[PDB]
Amino acid sequence: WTQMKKLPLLKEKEGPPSPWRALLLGADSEYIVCPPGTDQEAISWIHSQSEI
Amino acid sequence: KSLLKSTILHAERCKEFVGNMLEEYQDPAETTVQSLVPINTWGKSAKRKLQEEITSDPDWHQCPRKRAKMSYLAIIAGSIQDRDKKQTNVPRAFMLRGSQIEYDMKATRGLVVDTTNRIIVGGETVLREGKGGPEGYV
Numbered sequence: 001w002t003q004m005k006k007l008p009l010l011k012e013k014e015g016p017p018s019p020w021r022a023l024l025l026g027a028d029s030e031y032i033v034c035p036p037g038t039d040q041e042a043i044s045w046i047h048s049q050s051e052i
Numbered sequence: 053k054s055l056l057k058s059t060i061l062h063a064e065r066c067k068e069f070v071g072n073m074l075e076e077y078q079d080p081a082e083t084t085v086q087s088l089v090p091i092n093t094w095g096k097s098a099k100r101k102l103q104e105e106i107t108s109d110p111d112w113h114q115c116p117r118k119r120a121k122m123s124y125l126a127i128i129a130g131s132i133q134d135r136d137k138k139q140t141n142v143p144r145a146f147m148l149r150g151s152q153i154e155y156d157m158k159a160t161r162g163l164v165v166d167t168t169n170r171i172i173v174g175g176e177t178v179l180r181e182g183k184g185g186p187e188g189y190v
Contacts, residue, residue, distance in 0.1 A: 036161055038152045045175030 053174035055084055056164060059123040060171065060178055061186050066119045073126035074102050082130070089131035090149045097142045098129035116179055117159075117166055124157050124164075 020026070034042040059066045072079035079085070102125050105112060112118040128142055145156040154162035165172045171179035179186065 035165060037154070037163075041153065041163070041175055043175075045172075048174075048176035049172075 053163070053176075055081055055088075055127075056120075056123065056173045057178055060116055060119055060173065063113045063119065066123060067113050070102065070106075070113075070122050070126050073130045074099060076130075079130070085127050085130050086132055088148055089128060089146065091132045091134050092128075092146075093134050093137045093139045094128050094142045094146075095131060095133045096139050098125045101125050101142060102129060116171055120159055120164055120166060120171070121157060124155065124159075127155075 032046060034045055037045075059069055069079065069081070071077065073085070102122065105118075105122065105125070109118070112122060125142070128146065144158070145154055145162065147154055148163075156162045156164065159166040159171070163174055169181055170177050171181075
């Protein structure tokens, strides 16, 4: 039977940084403000008043 | 949206629409007007409003804001009038059939928004005041 002094140190993997992978964006999630209305009105406003 | 684009962008079309929609004439878009407005009792009130706004300003069919107000009143006027309930005053804004889309008289919110800089119908800027006139080029 043995007894310990120093708590284990978690080894850190090295290499390229792991990119973001999830269903959505997270903190980088913002929204566009649209005039009051239904979903269709907002979608129409966004599509008709924007260029990509 | 198509009906409002037709009425706003063309003064002659707006005049024809108002004339056919006020005196119960044959309008090529009667079914559209009937299907857009639910059963109500605002017909005669809207027709009367049309009367005051045609008598006071016979030159109305050049300001797009006036065209929008006249088209709104005309669309309400020829709706499916309820047989039983008595006629009431026309509401400032109403609701389209089978949808949560609000149509407004002053066009401050909903399907038509007319700011001093521009008029937007259905989320698309139909009129941009100052640049890009409604009519094309030759």
